[PDB]
């Protein structure tokens, strides 16, 4: 999978450099991307999905983002893992409606100075884990 | 190639000559039935992957055998109706819950029932009935329904039972995948038409 990602990037760079056989190199890079996406698609356990998404820190997801391997990142096997970290330390809030999320954003907007000053003790408190989740960082 | 000459001859005869298999499997202390290649398929698996009902019946005549569940799954994945009938006629399915419940949670699974070549299995959550529904084999679905195999409807997404929480704690991805597989089996036109009255 790492070999296919690197080869896809190299073939895309060659497609840019040549411009004569750009279609050939783009087709080859698409072949590499398709291979990576299929190998990810074969996963049927969390262990396999993790092994694909980071090698031996989502390393392969970051590499695919860098190399514009869009179908690998957008695959449900990767998306579920990304949502796992995204909605970390907060499980019920994932299932809430969009209106509840907007209300949470409004509450955070109202009370941002209070939580900011409480961050001096938050890591020793439970609320520090809540505010340190990626979704809460985005909301903040 | 760690396999001996006699077992190699028996295995290639099973894959391809019924009299050779009959002679090798009769009144011979050697030539173990559940032997396989180093990275190949079992004798039963080779006899089921290529359609040969009589050799499969001769292989299944032995009381002690392995990879019976994998043979059933491979036969069900295709239109091998008579092979499925012969395999289901084996006493192992009748005298156990192997036919109904999924390989992952059927039992302590010390014995390699549904096991594939080395470590894998199709997904461990796919029962023979679910696989038949997935492939849309009306005859196979009908046969499995007559044997008592039904697709168990997965619980609600927000279920709070002990089993659902236990499956959600570790490998939630496998939980979601197994739910999708069960719904793919249930939403199959074959299972829909043959499983219930007023479908
Ligand atoms: Zn439940």
Swiss-Prot record, chain A:
Entry comment describing in which tissues the protein is expressed: Expressed predominantly in brain and at much lower levels in ovary, colon, small intestine, lung, prostate, placenta and testis.
Compartments in which it is found: Cell membrane
Subunit structure: Homotetramer. Interacts with ITPR1. Interacts with ITPR3. Interacts with MX1. Interacts with RNF24. Interacts with JPH2; the interaction is involved in maintaining Ca(2+) homeostasis in skeletal muscle and is mediated by JPH2 'Ser-165' phosphorylation.
Similarity-based family: Belongs to the transient receptor (TC 1.A.4) family. STrpC subfamily. TRPC3 sub-subfamily.
Record remark on domains: The cytoplasmic portion of the protein is required for channel assembly and gating.
Disease field: Spinocerebellar ataxia 41: A form of spinocerebellar ataxia, a clinically and genetically heterogeneous group of cerebellar disorders. Patients show progressive incoordination of gait and often poor coordination of hands, speech and eye movements, due to degeneration of the cerebellum with variable involvement of the brainstem and spinal cord.
Entry function: Forms a receptor-activated non-selective calcium permeant cation channel.
Protein name: Short transient receptor potential channel 3
Upper lineage: Eukaryota, Metazoa, Chordata, Craniata, Vertebrata
Curated annotation (Swiss-Prot), chain B:
Signal peptide: none
Positions of ANK repeats: 5-33, 39-68, 70-96, 124-153
Domain of life, per lineage: Eukaryota
Tissue note: Expressed predominantly in brain and at much lower levels in ovary, colon, small intestine, lung, prostate, placenta and testis.
Residues that hold Ca(2+) 1 according to the record: 51
Family indicated by similarity: Belongs to the transient receptor (TC 1.A.4) family. STrpC subfamily. TRPC3 sub-subfamily.
Subunit text: Homotetramer. Interacts with ITPR1. Interacts with ITPR3. Interacts with MX1. Interacts with RNF24. Interacts with JPH2; the interaction is involved in maintaining Ca(2+) homeostasis in skeletal muscle and is mediated by JPH2 'Ser-165' phosphorylation.
Domain notes: The cytoplasmic portion of the protein is required for channel assembly and gating.
Protein's job: Forms a receptor-activated non-selective calcium permeant cation channel.
The protein, known as: Short transient receptor potential channel 3
Species in which this protein is naturally found: Homo sapiens (Human)
Gene it is expressed from: TRPC3
Residues of the full protein shown: 107 to 307 of 921
């Amino acid at each position: 999978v790492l070999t296919a990602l690197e080869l896809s990037n190299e073939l895309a760079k060659l497609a840019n450099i040549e411009k004569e056989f750009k279609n050939d190199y783009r087709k080859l890079s698409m072949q590499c991307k398709d291979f990576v996406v299929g190998v990810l698609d074969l996963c049927r356990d969390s262990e396999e999905v993790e092994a694909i998404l980071n090698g031996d820190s989502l390393s392969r997801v970051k590499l695919a983002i860098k190399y514009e391997v869009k179908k690998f990142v957008a695959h449900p096997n990767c998306q579920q893992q990304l949502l796992t970290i995204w909605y970390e330390n907060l499980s019920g809030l994932r299932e809430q409606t969009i209106a509840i999320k907007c209300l949470v954003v409004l509450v955070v907007a109202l009370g941002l100075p209070f939580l900011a000053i409480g961050y001096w003790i938050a890591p020793c408190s439970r609320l520090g884990k809540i505010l340190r989740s990626p979704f809460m960082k985005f909301v903040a | 190639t760690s396999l001996t000459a006699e077992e190699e001859r028996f295995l290639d005869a099973a894959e391809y000559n019924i009299p050779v298999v009959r002679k090798m499997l009769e009144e011979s202390k050697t030539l173990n039935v559940n032997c396989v290649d180093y990275m190949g398929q079992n004798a039963l698996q080779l006899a089921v992957g290529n359609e040969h009902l009589e050799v499969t019946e001769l292989l299944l005549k032995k009381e002690n055998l392995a990879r019976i569940g994998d043979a059933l799954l491979l036969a069900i994945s295709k239109g091998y109706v008579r092979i499925v009938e012969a395999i289901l006629n084996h006493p192992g399915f009748a005298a156990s819950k192997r036919l109904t419940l999924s390989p992952c949670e059927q039992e302590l699974q010390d014995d390699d029932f549904y096991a594939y070549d080395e470590d894998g299995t199709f997904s461990p959550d796919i029962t023979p009935i679910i696989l038949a529904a997935h492939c849309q084999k009306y005859e196979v679905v009908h046969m499995l329904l007559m044997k008592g195999a039904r697709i168990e409807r997965p619980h609600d997404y927000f279920c709070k039972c002990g089993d659902c929480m236990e499956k959600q704690r570790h490998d939630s991805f496998s939980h979601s995948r197994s739910r999708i597989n069960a719904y793919k089996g249930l939403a199959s036109p074959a299972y829909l038409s043959l499983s219930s009255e007023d479908p």
